[PDB]
């Protein structure tokens, strides 16, 4: 058995935390108290979901996890909510004024002086650690504390945790749902800081999430609730490897290993399905190869892109519910002859299978319904790039102008750093370009 | 077509299925570089305070 | 960032400044006296972002009352909730600056300000986290306009990583007390271009011809025009003072609508524009707010938004509505004039809605729009000026006060590049 | 009011397109750069798919088929057509096409090179139009670009009074439902000088290109002949009519090479939409058999048929999408 330490930066970590943890406790029978009627080695053992809860010689099963925002009012609705019992006080750490949307603020300015006192924190819960494997980190690229201190804590946990795994759980921004017109800027200055210390980083594109919560879950305007929720299941279906007894993605270093082999190339899409509302009457249930098979459609996607310009270089399918290895096999043989899916010449055209039995977990009154099957597909296209482009030309458009950049000069950055992080920006869309075609 | 490295269990399976085969910066420079940001921090505070106390 | 300091300077900060905490105190369910009589917890929630607590549950706002001439604060104390702001707060001289801004910011007014700064340092020690400060004055007169400046330069000075932020009231000859307004106005613009982070520009040009054209008065007092302002100051200190979507605060506010330090002034706008007492009984519905709030004819500032491009723009609904409509409607706007906002700033209009409808009326809606546009308000005031200031006119009113000729000529100089910065980026 | 933006200063097409939408006084033009479109009428080369369909508010179309420069570039069409199922190895329609590079098929290409030795019979390929494999490898080398190396149509159709040779264009348009529409008036590009069966120097009596031919204009207008004229002409001379000898077989190909890229190309279920406009190439032997030369990513019209294609161009596949305030195509049916 190994450790994992999850950290939750700003507030979308912060709150995607709070979405996960729910969803967690509901999957491993743990009560808002975080007593475990289930567990029988009360105050003690090494099993699967030992990876992401210690516990206390009382029977409480503490989350492994750090929240840490530069801002008071969302941690302290962790502190005062339903699982307030859960965490301990120490886990939860607060500033007093954030980053004010400014990458620079939160990176140099308030980075600085809370820096210290989160990897003491992190300390704190490595040493329970028989033998920690590494890092979950959940944050926005557009939020100052979120994109800032974010990459600064990315600097920091190389130097001090070398030998440990770091996985990103990264919100991409999206004018539907944004907070700041500069989200951009702070995009492209944390993916560069960010890079050499990330191993494997999934994007989610909120424009995405909010588009299928419109769609297939018929919600007029979707709140952070109902975006959280959705993120939270996606993230359930990718660490439910680690949580649960299995044999693919069994530690931090197999999504190295299984996704990503050219390792700038670390952006992974995910697709999710399905998603069915709740308050649905008469839901006709989704079949292996009709889920499978969704798993290529655009609109099922963490990021809007298109697969089918662009190359495979891994492919992982998670499944979770009613599914066999031969509907499977099955589902696969008929959507490789109907579907435009090309690899690299230098990779096998597969895929690596997960299926864990116990159907997904709805949180209850939530929008989604309880369905039978359902499918995770994790691969790692090209086509990805896409988000790389959009997010690329938004930054040109402002930054050709040098606009709002006096905000970041003002607490103590280069001008050269904007130019520095977008070089090496136009350096990664060249490098997906030559994998791709 | 081929299914490999079938492992199952209690919770559930997982495999492989081939279908064509093939064809860090420092603690001493983090610090610098923080340190240096607060200078230039420092000195454009100064500059408008000396602005100012004309 | 949730206390804010307010600093009302002059006859005519006083009056507006009287109105907001007027209004605020009425939406967050405030007597006259300081006691909460309101219905609602969601009332209570950000009222320390204006308010100090106080024993025995009492509330009293955080408001600093300046003036030299003890005549116009006597009329807040009076006044209908007068009662409420702390006695030690008002600050008075007794001389007056005499519609002179060398008298606000050299002479008279440096004789006061010390006693207003210890005013000021005693309410920024209890804050739990000071925000920034936020002016109420006009650029017309003295106190206000030379004082209020002075006040700001020093407050910069004390607290330098705070938000400054001004509701700064532009002259006009529609609505003129003095013939030295223009050159009262053009030394303040210099002093608000460097010291401010945000500027509300309330043009009294703009509020004569909303109340003379549209609200149909055919002449109108100062209370009109100032019915119009806390209406309008209601409006767009909404989402400090009340729990949405996003964590509003002034700096937030400051990176997202400044791209640029010295472009910070900002063209005001509500819907639906409503004088006085009467009341509309019929409630608008969210096409008609967007519709109006774009509109020129809804602007506080005397500027034809057609005539320049918008950089960036914040808009606030307020009211039980489908929010569904209004992100439609405020989508439909920038696809039908997309033009008139600048391309090499993306997705530059943010939108926000609060459930809490402001007194008398069902649904509303308040703008703010940094628009290259606001430069025809700073060359309206250039060219009054130097018609007199060609001829040396007026000027032994300054002169008797230790100013020179050359400090007119500075002034006129970087309001004359503030307007070739913004001729910059409406072409660009 | 719908909003479109212009990015294809060369296209002659769309430039009227562009002409007739503002006419109508319901679409704006915005300046190159402004997001905020509706339609996007897009450039040649390296245009940014992936930019499209990500603006709240806006239902966005474009001019073009992300993938359709597969069926476009001739070394790709090669490739398309013997390495798709639905194409087959055996295609009836399609001219034998070998893709060679510059310091590869050439082995493959030297066998099939011998049969035509070991039969003695027609052994003539176009890149120039030489006999001999061994002086064709050195013009491809020469050059630096990726050349195909196609078997020549030795025996052609040839048009009375004047031995002539001549190419048929075929105009189709592809709208935002993948329904593949032909345009009822087609055009030959026609040679003015006679055919020429052991000279292969000459280029001006093989090659039909209209720019090449500017003799001139001596049995028709700027070489082309119509499709009512060539019709009656067939009537005539052959006893035959367009639909049944030569018509047929174009719907056939045209169906069959938009079919095959359909599950790449489709933006059915995509957050952009696409149409796009085709020009289609086609070569008539002795016998009636209809062969595929090229497709054309952007096609030029004929100068007389610019008014009501363009007009074809809104009605079907723009103001399907943009409804405002009979039919010239036939629809391809699968
Ligand atoms: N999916 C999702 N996105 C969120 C949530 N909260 C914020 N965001 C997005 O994250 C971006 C803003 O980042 P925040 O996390 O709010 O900022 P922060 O990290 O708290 O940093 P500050 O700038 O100091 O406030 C915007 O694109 C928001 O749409 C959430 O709960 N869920
Ligand atoms: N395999 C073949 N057999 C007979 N004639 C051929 C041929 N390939 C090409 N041609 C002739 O050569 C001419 C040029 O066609 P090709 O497709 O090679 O050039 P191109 O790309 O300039 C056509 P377009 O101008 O429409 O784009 C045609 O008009 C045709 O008559
Ligand atoms: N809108 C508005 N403008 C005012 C009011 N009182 C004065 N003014 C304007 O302010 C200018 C004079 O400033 P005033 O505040 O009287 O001078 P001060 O007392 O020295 O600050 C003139 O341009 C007037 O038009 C008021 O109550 N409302
Ligand atoms: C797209 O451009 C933007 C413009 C302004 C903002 C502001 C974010 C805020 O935190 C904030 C602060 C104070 C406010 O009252 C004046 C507002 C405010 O923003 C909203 C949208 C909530 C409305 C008013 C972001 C982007
Ligand atoms: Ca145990
Ligand atoms: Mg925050
Ligand atoms: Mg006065």
Redesign the pocket.
Same mark, same amino acid.
């Given at each position: 058995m190994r450790e994992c330490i999850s950290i939750h930066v700003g507030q979308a970590g912060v709150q995607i935390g709070n979405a996960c943890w729910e969803l967690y406790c509901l999957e491993h029978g743990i009560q808002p108290d975080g007593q475990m009627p289930s567990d029988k080695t009360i105050g003690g053992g090494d099993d699967s979901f030992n990876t992401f809860f210690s516990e206390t010689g009382a029977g409480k099963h503490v989350p492994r996890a750090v929240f840490v925002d530069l801002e008071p009012t969302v941690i302290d609705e962790v502190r005062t909510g339903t699982y307030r019992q859960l965490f301990h006080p120490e886990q939860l750490i607060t500033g007093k004024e954030d980053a004010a949307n400014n990458y620079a603020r939160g990176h140099y300015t308030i980075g600085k002086e809370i820096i210290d006192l989160v990897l003491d924190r992190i300390r704190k819960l490595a040493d329970q650690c028989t033998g920690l494997q590494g890092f979950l980190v959940f944050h926005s690229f557009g939020g100052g504390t979120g994109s800032g201190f974010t990459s600064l804590l990315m600097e920091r946990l190389s130097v001090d945790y070398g030998k440990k795994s770091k996985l990103e759980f990264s919100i991409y921004p999206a004018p539907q749902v944004s907070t700041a017109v500069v989200e951009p800027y702070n995009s492209i200055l944390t993916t560069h800081t960010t890079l050499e210390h990330s191993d494997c980083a999934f994007m989610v594109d909120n424009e995405a999430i909010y588009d299928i919560c419109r769609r297939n879950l018929d919600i007029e305007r979707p709140t952070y609730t109902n975006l959280n929720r959705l993120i939270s299941q996606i993230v359930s279906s990718i660490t439910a490897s680690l949580r649960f007894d299995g044999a693919l993605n069994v530690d931090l270093t197999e999504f190295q290993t299984n996704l990503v082999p050219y390792p700038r190339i670390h952006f992974p899409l995910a697709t999710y399905a399905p998603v069915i509302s709740a308050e649905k009457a008469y839901h006709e249930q989704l079949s292996v190869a009709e889920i499978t098979n969704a798993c290529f459609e655009p609109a099922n996607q963490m990021v809007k892109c298109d697969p089918r310009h662009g190359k495979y270089m891994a492919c992982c399918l998670l499944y979770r519910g009613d599914v066999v290895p031969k509907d499977v096999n099955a589902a696969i043989a008929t959507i490789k002859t109907k579907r435009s899916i090309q690899f690299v010449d230098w990779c096998p055209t597969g895929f690596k299978v997960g299926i864990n039995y116990q159907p997904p977990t709805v949180v209850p009154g939530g929008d989604l319904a309880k369905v039978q099957r359902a499918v995770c597909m994790l691969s790692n296209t090209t086509a990805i790039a896409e988000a790389w482009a959009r997010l690329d030309h938004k930054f040109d458009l402002m930054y050709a102008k040098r606009a709002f950049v006096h905000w970041y000069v003002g607490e103590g950055m280069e001008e050269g750093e904007f130019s520095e992080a977008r070089e090496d920006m136009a350096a990664l869309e060249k490098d997906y370009e030559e994998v791709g075609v | 077509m081929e299914v490999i490295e079938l492992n199952k269990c209690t919770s559930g399976q997982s495999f492989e299925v081939i279908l064509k085969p093939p064809s860090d910066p420092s603690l001493e420079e983090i610090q610098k570089k923080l340190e240096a940001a607060e200078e230039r921090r420092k000195y454009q505070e100064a500059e408008l305070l000396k602005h100012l106390a004309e | 960032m949730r206390e804010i300091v307010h600093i009302q300077?002059?006859?005519? /900060?006083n009056?507006?400044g009287a109105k907001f905490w007027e209004v605020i105190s009425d939406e967050h369910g405030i007597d006259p006296t300081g006691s909460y009589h309101g219905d609602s917890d969601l009332q209570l929630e950000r009222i320390n972002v204006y308010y100090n607590e106080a024993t025995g549950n009492k509330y009293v706002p955080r408001a600093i009352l300046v =003036?030299l #001439?003890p005549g &116009?604060m006597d009329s807040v104390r009076s006044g209908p909730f007068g009662q409420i702001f702390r006695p030690d707060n008002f600050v008075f001289g007794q001389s007056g600056?005499g !519609?002179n801004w060398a008298k /606000?910011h050299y002479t008279e007014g440096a004789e006061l300000v010390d006693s207003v700064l210890d005013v000021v340092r005693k309410e920024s020690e209890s804050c739990d986290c000071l925000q920034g400060f936020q002016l109420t004055? +006009?650029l %017309? %007169? /003295? &106190? /206000? +306009?030379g004082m209020g400046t002075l006040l700001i330069s020093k407050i910069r000075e004390e607290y330098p990583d705070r938000i400054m932020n001004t509701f700064s009231?532009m002259? +006009?000859p529609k $609505?003129? =007390?003095t013939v030295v #307004?223009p050159y009262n106005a053009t030394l303040s613009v210099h002093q608000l271009v460097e010291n401010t982070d945000e500027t509300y520009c309330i043009d !009294?040009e703009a *509020?004569y011809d909303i109340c003379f054209r549209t609200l149909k008065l055919t002449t109108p007092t100062?209370g009109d *025009?100032?019915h119009l $302002?806390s209406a309008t100051m209601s409006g767009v200190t909404t989402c400090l003072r009340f729990p949405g979507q996003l964590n509003a605060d002034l700096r937030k506010l400051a990176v997202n609508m400044v791209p640029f330090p010295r472009l910070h002034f900002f063209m005001p706008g509500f819907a639906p524009l409503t004088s006085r007492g009467s009341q509309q009984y019929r409630a608008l519905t969210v096409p008609e707010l967007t519709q109006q709030m774009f509109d020129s004819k809804n602007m506080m500032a005397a500027c034809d938004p057609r005539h320049g491009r918008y950089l960036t723009v914040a808009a606030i609904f307020r009211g039980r509505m489908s929010m569904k409509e209004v992100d439609e409607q405020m989508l439909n706007v920038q696809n039908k004039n997309s033009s008139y906002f600048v391309e090499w700033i993306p997705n530059n209009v943010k939108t926000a809605v609060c459930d809490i409808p402001p007194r008398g009326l069902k649904m509303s809606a308040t703008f703010i729009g940094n628009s290259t546009a606001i430069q025809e308000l700073f060359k309206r005031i250039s060219e009054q000026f130097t018609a007199m200031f060609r001829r040396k006119a007026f000027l032994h009113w300054y002169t008797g006060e230790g100013m020179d000729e050359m400090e007119f000529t500075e002034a006129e100089s970087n309001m004359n590049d503030l307007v070739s910065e913004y001729q910059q980026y409406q072409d660009a | 009011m719908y909003t479109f933006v212009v990015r294809d200063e060369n296209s002659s097409v769309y430039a009227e397109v562009s002409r007739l939408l503002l006419a109508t006084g319901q679409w704006k033009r915005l300046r190159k750069d402004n997001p905020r479109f509706n339609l996007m009428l897009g450039e040649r080369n390296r245009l940014p798919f992936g930019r499209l369909g990500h603006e709240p508010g806006l239902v966005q179309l474009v001019n073009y088929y992300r993938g359709a420069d597969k069926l476009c570039r001739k070394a790709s069409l090669v490739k398309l057509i013997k390495t798709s199922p639905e194409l087959s190895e055996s295609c009836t329609w399609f001219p034998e096409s070998y893709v060679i590079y510059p310091t590869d098929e050439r082995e493959v290409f030297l066998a099939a090179y011998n049969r035509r030795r070991e039969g003695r019979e027609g052994n003539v390929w176009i890149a120039l139009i030489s006999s001999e494999a061994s002086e064709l490898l050195d013009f491809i080398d020469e050059q630096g670009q990726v050349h195909v190396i196609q078997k020549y149509l030795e025996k052609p159709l040839l048009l009375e009074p004047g031995h002539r040779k001549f190419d048929i264009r075929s105009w189709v348009l592809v709208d935002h439902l993948y329904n593949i529409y032909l345009y009822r008036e087609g055009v030959l590009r026609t040679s003015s000088e006679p055919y020429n069966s052991a000279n292969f120097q000459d280029k001006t009596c093989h090659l039909t290109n209209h720019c090449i031919q500017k003799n001139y204009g001596r049995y028709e207008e700027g070489n082309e002949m119509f499709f009512e004229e060539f019709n009656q002409y067939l009537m005539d001379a052959l006893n035959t009519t367009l639909e049944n000898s030569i018509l047929l077989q174009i719907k056939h190909i045209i169906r069959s090479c938009l079919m095959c890229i359909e599950p790449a190309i489709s933006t059915k279920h995509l957050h952009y939409q696409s149409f796009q406009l085709f020009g289609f190439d086609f070569m008539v032997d002795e016998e009636l058999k209809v062969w595929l030369i090229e497709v054309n990513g952007a096609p030029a019209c004929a100068q007389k048929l610019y008014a009501e294609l363009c007009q074809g161009i809104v009605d079907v596949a723009i103001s399907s999408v943009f409804p405002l305030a009979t039919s010239i195509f036939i629809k391809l049916h699968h």
């Open positions: - | - | 300077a002059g006859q005519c /900060g009056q507006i =003036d #001439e &116009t600056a !519609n /606000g004055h +006009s %017309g %007169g /003295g &106190t /206000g +306009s009231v002259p +006009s $609505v003129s =007390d #307004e !009294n *509020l100062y *025009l100032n $302002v | -």
